[PDB]
Amino acid sequence: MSTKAEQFASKIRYLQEYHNRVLHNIYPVPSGTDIANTLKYFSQTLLSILSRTGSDYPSLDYQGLYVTLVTLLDLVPLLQHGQHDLGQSIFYTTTCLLPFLNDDILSTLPYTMISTLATFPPFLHKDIIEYLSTSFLPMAILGSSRREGVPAHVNLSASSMLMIAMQYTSNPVYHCQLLECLMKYKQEVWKDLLYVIAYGPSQVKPPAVQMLFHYWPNLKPPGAISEYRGLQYTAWNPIHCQHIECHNAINKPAVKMCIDPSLSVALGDKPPPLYLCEECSERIAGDHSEWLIDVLLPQAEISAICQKKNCSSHVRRAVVTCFSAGCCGRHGNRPVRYCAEELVCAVEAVISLLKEAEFQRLLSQFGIWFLVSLCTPSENTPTESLARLVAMVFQWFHSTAYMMDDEVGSLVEKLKPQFVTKWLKTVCDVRFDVMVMCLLPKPMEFARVGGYWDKSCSTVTQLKEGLNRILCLIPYN
Amino acid sequence: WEPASNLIEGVCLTLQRQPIISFLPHLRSLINVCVNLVMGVYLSPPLPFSTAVVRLVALQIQALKEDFPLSHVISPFTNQERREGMLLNLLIPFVLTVGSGSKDSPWLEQPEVQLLLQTVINVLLPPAESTSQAAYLALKVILVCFERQLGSQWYWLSLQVKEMALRKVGGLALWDFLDFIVRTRIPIFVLLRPFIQCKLLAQPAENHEELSARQHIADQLERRFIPRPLCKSSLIAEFNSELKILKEAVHSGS
Numbered sequence: 024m025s026t027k028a029e030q031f032a033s034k035i036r037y038l039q040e041y042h043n044r045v046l047h048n049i050y051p052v053p054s055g056t057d058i059a060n061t062l063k064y065f066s067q068t069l070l071s072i073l074s075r076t077g078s079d080y081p082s083l084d085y086q087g088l089y090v091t092l093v094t095l096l097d098l099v100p101l102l103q104h105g106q107h108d109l110g111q112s113i114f115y116t117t118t119c120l121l122p123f124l125n126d127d128i129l130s131t132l133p134y135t136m137i138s139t140l141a142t143f144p145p146f147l148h149k150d151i152i153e154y155l156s157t158s159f160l161p162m163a164i165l166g167s168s169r170r171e172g173v174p175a176h177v178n179l180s181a182s183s184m185l186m187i188a189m190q191y192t193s194n195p196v197y198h199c200q201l202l203e204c205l206m207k208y209k210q211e212v213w214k215d216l217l218y219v220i221a222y223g224p225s226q227v228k229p230p231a232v233q234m235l236f237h238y239w240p241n242l243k244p245p246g247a248i249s250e251y252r253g254l255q256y257t258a259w260n261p262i263h264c265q266h267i268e269c270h271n272a273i274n275k276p277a278v279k280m281c282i283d284p285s286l287s288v289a290l291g292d293k294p295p296p297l298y299l300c301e302e303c304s305e306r307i308a309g310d311h312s313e314w315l316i317d318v319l320l321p322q323a324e325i326s327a328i329c330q331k332k333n334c335s336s337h338v339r340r341a342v343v344t345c346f347s348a349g350c351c352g353r354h355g356n357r358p359v360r361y362c363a364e365e366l367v368c369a370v371e372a373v374i375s376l377l378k379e380a381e382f383q384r385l386l387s388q389f390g391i392w393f394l395v396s397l398c399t400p401s402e403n404t405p406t407e408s409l410a411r412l413v414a415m416v417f418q419w420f421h422s423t424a425y426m427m428d429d430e431v432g433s434l435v436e437k438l439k440p441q442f443v444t445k446w447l448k449t450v451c452d453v454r455f456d457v458m459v460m461c462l463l464p465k466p467m468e469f470a471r472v473g474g475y476w477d478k479s480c481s482t483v484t485q486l487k488e489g490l491n492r493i494l495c496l497i498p499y500n
Numbered sequence: 501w502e503p504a505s506n507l508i509e510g511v512c513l514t515l516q517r518q519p520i521i522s523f524l525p526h527l528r529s530l531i532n533v534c535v536n537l538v539m540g541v542y543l544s545p546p547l548p549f550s551t552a553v554v555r556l557v558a559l560q561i562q563a564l565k566e567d568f569p570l571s572h573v574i575s576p577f578t579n580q581e582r583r584e585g586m587l588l589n590l591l592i593p594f595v596l597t598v599g600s601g602s603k604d605s606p607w608l609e610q611p612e613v614q615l616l617l618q619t620v621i622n623v624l625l626p627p628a629e630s631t632s633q634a635a636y637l638a639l640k641v642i643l644v645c646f647e648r649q650l651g652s653q654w655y656w657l658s659l660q661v662k663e664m665a666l667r668k669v670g671g672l673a674l675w676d677f678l679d680f681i682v683r684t685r686i687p688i689f690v691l692l693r694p695f696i697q698c699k700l701l702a703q704p705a706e707n708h709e710e711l712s713a714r715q716h717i718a719d720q721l722e723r724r725f726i727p728r729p730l731c732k733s734s735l736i737a738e739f740n741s742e743l744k745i746l747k748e749a750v751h752s753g754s
Contacts, residue, residue: 115626134694143656174702180694187655187691224687226651375729382603408726475601478646479736481518 027068028082034065035084038091048101056105059112066112069119070292076284080123089128092116096139110147118158118294122284122311130176137184152197153262156204157298160271161280164208165316177209182219189227189234193261196259198234199321205384206238207319207346207358214365221372225379227357232386238358244392244438250430251385252336264300265293271302278421279304279315301356317348320356342396367408370398378473381422387435391442393489399454407469413450413458414470416443420499421492443499464489501549508534515559522563531560535575538589541582544751554593561608574619583623587638587657591616593623595638596739600646600738613646614653615690621660624669632670634746636677642740643686644732658691658716665700682721682732695720 052173053061072081085324096113099106124132143151164177190199190284220231236242237256243249253419264272268290277298281287281483286307287295328334329341341362351359400409423439426432450458461470464486478485511530514521521527534553538545545553559570574590577583598608621644624637643650664674678696681689701721705714 131698138655174694174697176694176698179697182696183691186687190654221688222656222685222687223690224651371726371729407728411729422512468731468734473729476731476733477599477601477736478733479597479599 024072024081027072031065031083034061035087035091035458038095042094044090046098046101050277053111054104055102059105059108062112062116062381063108066115066119069115073119073122073294074285074288076122076288083123085120085125086128088116088120093135093139097142099141106144107150110143110150114150114154115349118154121158121162122295122465126167126170129163129167130173133160133186134176134180137187140187144193148192148194148197152194152200153260156200157262158294158296158333160204161208161296162282166274168209177205178211178215181205181209181212182215183222184361185216186219186223186227189231190224195234195237195254195256198230199237200259202234202238203274203319203321203358206344207348210346213344216371217372221368221375228275228376228379228386229383231332232389237325239344240325240391241342242325242392242396243340244388244442245338248434250434251383256323256325258321261321262298264298266291266297266299266303266324267293269303271300275300275302276356277303277318278318278320278352279308279312280318281307282312282314283307283311288322317352318356319351322357329362330354330357331362336362364403366398367404370394370408370412373398374411374473377415377419380419384426384431387419387423388438391438395442395446400449406457409454410459410461410467410470411472413461417461417492417496418474421495424492424495441447462493501545505546505549505552508549508556510725512552512555512559515563519563522560528560535590539575539582539585542751544589544616544747550589550593551597554590554597557590557594558597561612562606570615574616580631584634587620587623587631587634588743588750591620591638592641592739594742595641595645596736607649610649610652613642613649616642617650617653617657621657625660625663625667629670629671630746633673636673637672637739637742638675640680643688644684644735647686654688654691658688661688661692662695665695672710672713675710679717680715682717683727684735685727693721701707720727 063077073271092113099109133155136155140151166191168175168177171485185201185205185303188198192198214230218388220228220235233254234256261274261276264275264277267274278301279299281297281299281304282295284295287293287297291297298318299315328339329336341360343361345361346358351357353359373393376386377390404412420439423432423435426435460466465471476485511527515527534556538550538553544550557573561570561573575586577586600607620635620638624639625634665678668674678692678700681692682696696717701714701718705711
């Protein structure tokens, strides 16, 4: 390897002198067809370089290539001709650096990956969703999570990447792909997904519980008369297997992952990792099964009954999810689901869930079967939280005295008796002093918060509507 | 100025009750002359006259909803001290007055409010200190007062506030802004707190006051428990108190 690092540095120098050139877009700019025709020769020589990989680092630059690649990725919307093979060439470039990456910029890999989702058109998003979960995220969750202690991005920035995914895409294929892969690959995803349903924006409150409910089909109340069966979750496309020199590489999904670099490169004519099927994996599963970690199959029917067959719970809907990869392959590689002091912020999520239920509001019933399932009123809950809870539930009683003669309004006025009434009876048992302290016209600053308090007008009509909601509150028994 | 403000509120009640009287250009010259008198382009009118002028501007924008391109309404000022005077007197009272919130009543739609967003960022970044803090206050009030209608454009201004943090523009005003961000938890912080703990709180500072602000925001951040969903009329009172602080700061001779 003498002229290969020389010619990669020469193209780095070419893009550097074209970057110090202020981007006036003077022609000839090389088109994306010509850019990917050059980088296809670069992909072939990178294939012949990464045919000997087993830290076998050559003398290539991977740090300035990162900033050159993100500036090229921001030159993607400035292009017209040749965008699909440009995206394929960017994909080949980044995945061939993935064995030869430094551990200082690899932590900020997948957020920068999702940061250019909105710049791409939706017809390139299918290649994005067909390549990410194969290559980009798993090596960041495998190669970088062995060194914990540092702040990793699946702890902090997973909610950010998932909000951007809920924002910019409208495919249950894309959201189901990213939700299953990030839940299966890393634990404690449910707390950050609760945290993004909690303090996320308002337009991602419908789909982040809609696409959750494929994987969380339990928060429906019993006797589940449901008319919100819009976009019935047909799962994602079965992945077309890269290993050309296999036998069954047409239709079946993958179950393990070949990450051994030299065999994958010199056998599949495609970058590592190779996602191996059930029949594909068991050839090198005898000596190299420390690399093969269990992947799961696209389940278009995730059962609302519990997925373990030896059922013993009384309620067929099972709440808690644990996702180890021990024995989740007795049904067709299907994700098996299962059945203390962390409660209060969960109820805070419900405060922020039902706060924008003022104006298809099926999330009120999800809060109803959330609050009575595993949220316990005790002395661990502080005074401010209980005051905030009783004030927000009083606004919910008044706002459900509204919404007259709509179907979801008829459903929320059907489930308003016999479900929250025992909760208010427990409230009257344990903390009736703080409720009648909150029934005072101007309470303490821990109580009268939120809502439409931002008014540049008189606040005494707010007290008149407070007396009106007390009037609507009295014949509720 | 108090009966003059009474006159202007007489005009304002005529606009409030009779919407069809907004056609004659004499009313438009009244709007233009009261805006240029409120701007003064050292002697500023009191709060009722300024409230009357801003409510007149608010009515003229809602009523003539097809004409009146806002680029001369939020007027052109090549001098930046006139620009920060526009931010103080014209912009942020307009933001506080326009925010009623009733879902059956309309308000300023999407293109004028994104012009406002790009306006405040282009004040902030060039596409020296009190003008920058006033721009942070304008960004503060448009973020808190327009929660429901800026539902498309979060990531681009996430990159702009990323650029703000990369340049340390203003200094401690950025730390007060991110302290508000991590305190009240408005939904841009989900794309900002990994940038805090991974870049800003991971790379230390050098100035001792910036160290004390950094330890302050670190103790506010590292407590991962339940935050305070404030009543936020006290946030409006903080806007008025900061407005009065800067109002006595600019009429003090220096």
